Amino acid sequence: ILLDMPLRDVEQIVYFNSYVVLNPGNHSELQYKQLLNEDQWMEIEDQIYAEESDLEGIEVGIGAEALQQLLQDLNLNEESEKLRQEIAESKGQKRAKLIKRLRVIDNFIGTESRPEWMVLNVIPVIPPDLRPMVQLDGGRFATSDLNDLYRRVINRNNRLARLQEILAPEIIVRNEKRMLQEAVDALIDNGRRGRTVVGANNRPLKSLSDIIEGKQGRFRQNLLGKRVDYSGRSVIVVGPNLKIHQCGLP
Amino acid sequence: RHPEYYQKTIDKEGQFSEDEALMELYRKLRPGEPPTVSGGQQLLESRFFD
Amino acid sequence: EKARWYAVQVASGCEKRVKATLEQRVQTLDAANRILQVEIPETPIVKLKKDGSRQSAEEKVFPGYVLVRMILDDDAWQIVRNTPHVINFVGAEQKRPYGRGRGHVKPMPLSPGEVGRIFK
DNA sequence: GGGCGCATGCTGCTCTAGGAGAGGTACACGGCGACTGCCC
DNA sequence: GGGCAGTCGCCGTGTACCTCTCCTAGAGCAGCATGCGCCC
RNA sequence: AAAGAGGAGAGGUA
Ligand SMILES: Nc1ccn([C@@H]2O[C@H](COP(=O)(O)OP(=O)(O)OP(=O)(O)O)[C@@H](O)[C@H]2O)c(=O)n1
Numbered sequence: 444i445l446l447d448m449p450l451r452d453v454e455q456i457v458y459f460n461s462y463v464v465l466n467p468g469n470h471s472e473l474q475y476k477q478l479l480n481e482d483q484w485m486e487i488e489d490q491i492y493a494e495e496s497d498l499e500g501i502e503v504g505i506g507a508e509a510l511q512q513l514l515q516d517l518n519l520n521e522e523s524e525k526l527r528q529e530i531a532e533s534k535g536q537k538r539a540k541l542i543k544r545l546r547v548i549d550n551f552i553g554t555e556s557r558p559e560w561m562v563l564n565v566i567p568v569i570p571p572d573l574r575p576m577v578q579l580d581g582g583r584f585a586t587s588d589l590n591d592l593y594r595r596v597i598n599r600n601n602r603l604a605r606l607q608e609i610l611a612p613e614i615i616v617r618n619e620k621r622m623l624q625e626a627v628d629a630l631i632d633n634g635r636r637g638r639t640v641v642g643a644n645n646r647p648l649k650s651l652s653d654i655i656e657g658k659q660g661r662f663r664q665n666l667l668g669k670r671v672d673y674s675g676r677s678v679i680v681v682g683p684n685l686k687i688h689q690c691g692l693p
Numbered sequence: 694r695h696p697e698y699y700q701k702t703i704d705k706e707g708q709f710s711e712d713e714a715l716m717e718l719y720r721k722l723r724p725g726e727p728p729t730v731s732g733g734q735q736l737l738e739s740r741f742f743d
Numbered sequence: 744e745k746a747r748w749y750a751v752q753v754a755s756g757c758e759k760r761v762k763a764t765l766e767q768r769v770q771t772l773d774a775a776n777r778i779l780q781v782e783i784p785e786t787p788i789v790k791l792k793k794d795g796s797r798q799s800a801e802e803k804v805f806p807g808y809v810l811v812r813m814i815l816d817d818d819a820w821q822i823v824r825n826t827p828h829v830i831n832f833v834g835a836e837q838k839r840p841y842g843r844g845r846g847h848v849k850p851m852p853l854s855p856g857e858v859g860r861i862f863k
Numbered sequence: 864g865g866g867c868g869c870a871t872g873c874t875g876c877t878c879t880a881g882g883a884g885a886g887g888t889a890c891a892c893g894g895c896g897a898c899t900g901c902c903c
Numbered sequence: 904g905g906g907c908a909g910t911c912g913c914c915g916t917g918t919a920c921c922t923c924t925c926c927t928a929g930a931g932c933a934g935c936a937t938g939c940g941c942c943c
Numbered sequence: 944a945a946a947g948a949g950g951a952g953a954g955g956u957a
Contacts, residue, residue, distance in 0.1 A: 449898090455838065458836075459836060460836055460837070460838055481835045481849070535905095536906095575948070575949085576948090577927090577948040577949065578948085579927085579947085579948060579949090580926090580927060583927065583928090584927075585926095585927055585948060585949060585950090586926080586927040586928090586949080586950075587927095587949080588950095591880095591881095594879095594880085594881095595880080595881070598879085598880070598881080602806075606805075609804070610860075611805070612750075612853055612854070612857040612861075614750070614833055614834070614851055614853070615750060615805060615808065615833065618752075618833065622882070637843065638843065638844070638883085638884095640881090642928090643926085643927080643928055643929090644926090644951085645887095646950095646951080649950095676919095676920080724839075724840045724841070724847075725837060725839075725840070725846060725847030726847060727817055729817065729821075732821070752882080754882080754883095755879080755880065755881070755882070756879090756880095756930090756931080807882080830882065830883065830884095831883090844883095844884090845883085845884095864943105865942105865943095866941105866942100866943095867940105867941085867942095868939105868940090868941080868942105869938105869939090869940080869941095870937105870938085870939080870940095871936105871937085871938080871939100872935105872936095872937080872938095873934105873935085873936085873937095874933105874934090874935085874936100875932105875933095875934085875935095876931105876932085876933085876934095877930105877931085877932085877933100878929105878930100878931090878932105879928105879929100879930100879931105880928095880929100892915105892916095893914105893915090893916100894913105894914085894915090895912105895913090895914090896911105896912095896913095897910105897911090897912090898909105898910090898911085899908105899909090899910085899911105900907105900908090900909080900910100901906105901907100901908100902905105902906090902907095903904105903905085903906090918957105919957085920955105920956075920957085921954105921955075921956070922953105922954080922955080923952105923953080923954080924951105924952080924953080925950105925951080925952080926949105926950080926951075926952105927948105927949090927950085
């Protein structure tokens with residue numbers, strides 16, 4: 444909604460399936476925020492690299508995450524004024540859509556937030572006492588699901604850093620970047636986008652979003668109801684000759 | 694027993710040869726991969742006759 | 744020569760097996776003209792043991808990929824993709840038309856400068 | 864025959880990994896919002 | 904241009920209590936105790 | 944000073 448693009452294009456720029464034009468340059472067919480392909484990028488690369496003139500417009504087409512750069516180029520006040528001006532001369536379903544966008548934009552002005560904060564550079568790690576290891580099994584150890592996801596994320600990060608250090612060819616690095624993105628996605632919310640991570644048996648793991656979600660989540664199990672001390676339970680029989688305010692306790 | 698009923702399917706879907714049918718089977722069963730006659734034969738044999 | 748260099752994704756710790764199996768298959772199929780040579784680049788680096796002495800053992804530079812010199816043709820692609828312990832080629836991914844799962848990966852050769860750099 | 868040396872099956876330490884399907888498929892039911900086809 | 908109509912995907916589906924079992928991963932590599940052959 | 948950690952199946956009683 445913020446970038447005014449369909450979800451398919453944004454999903455294709457991420458996960459390394461297409462390119463995006465970050466700067467048209469002095470071209471006649473290229474446009475800002477235009478989806479490209481491998482063959483088309485090859486054609487434009489042949490055109491620019493033919494050592495010709497009139498193409499020295501610095502065409503910047505980067506097919507990567509490349510969302511931080513697009514979100515960093517946003518000016519909120521100018522877009523707010525433009526949308527407010529354009530709202531009046533419109534009607535029907537065309538107006539409503541614009542209204543929606545306007546809403547979001549004004550939010551980012553009220554809270555003084557930056558739209559590029561939706562792309563992550565650092566990841567928090569939960570305290571270790573909330574994901575215990577447990578020392579049963581005699582010689583083995585218990586299974587916890589958060590630790591596996593954290594370990595996978597760390598492994599992918601270390602491999603990508605090592606590959607980047609020694610200047611590997613830039614067709615193997617993109618693979619590692621894609622697997623790192625998928626690993627982080629699986630850590631946050633398992634099965635929301637693509638395939639689900641499966642443990643030993645064909646049973647999906649429990650992510651961070653599965654702890655707070657449903658009937659067995661934190662809210663409806665540990666906060667709105669609890670187990671208590673000083674309580675008992677037993678079978679009931681009938682006692683006549685009692686008073687209406689009395690009971691019999693073993 | 695009613696051959697005139699299948700004529701509609703033949704007309705509205707066109708006619709095929711063995712190799713063209715195998716190529717079409719590969720195309721629809723495995724999207725994206727380059728079609729091949731031997732490939733489609735392999736899918737058919739591994740699907741319904743192995 | 745049209746024989747270009749490609750990278751193939753294999754299983755973890757299953758690169759020597761893939762190399763041996765692929766070379767044996769390509770020899771027994773009399774297709775040595777299409778697939779020329781497969782390799783797993785290595786580099787000896789200091790491997791300091793319990794004491795201060797370095798074992799200086801060999802480790803892989805790309806732990807998970809194997810390099811193949813071949814002429815990219817349909818049949819050779821079919822033989823290569825049918826080898827056990829091989830996931831897929833390395834290249835440009837494509838959007839899956841319908842349903843979930845991965846798409847079709849178009850192979851891409853290594854540039855002459857890179858292939859010069861890896862091969863000293 | 865007997866002590867010793869080597870081959871070998873058994874088993875415990877280790878580490879590492881972690882990708883991607885193989886196929887376990889085809890398999891409930893209602894309500895609501897977000898795209899897309901083919902025509903007027 | 905302007906849509907209707909159709910289709911696809913995500914959300915939801917009462918409460919307390921009792922008993923029995925199986926599992927925390929799986930494959931490579933090296934140490935070891937055993938069996939069998941050898942030279943005196 | 945110490946003492947139980949979770950998970951998954953199957954079967955019951957209001
Ligand atoms: N799925 C169920 C089954 C039973 N109950 C509880 O258990 C009671 C069943 O009582 P029960 O003794 O089995 O039957 P009654 O209807 O009382 O009839 P009777 O005692 O005469 O057989 C229900 O009313 C209800 O309080 C329930 O909550 N949920």
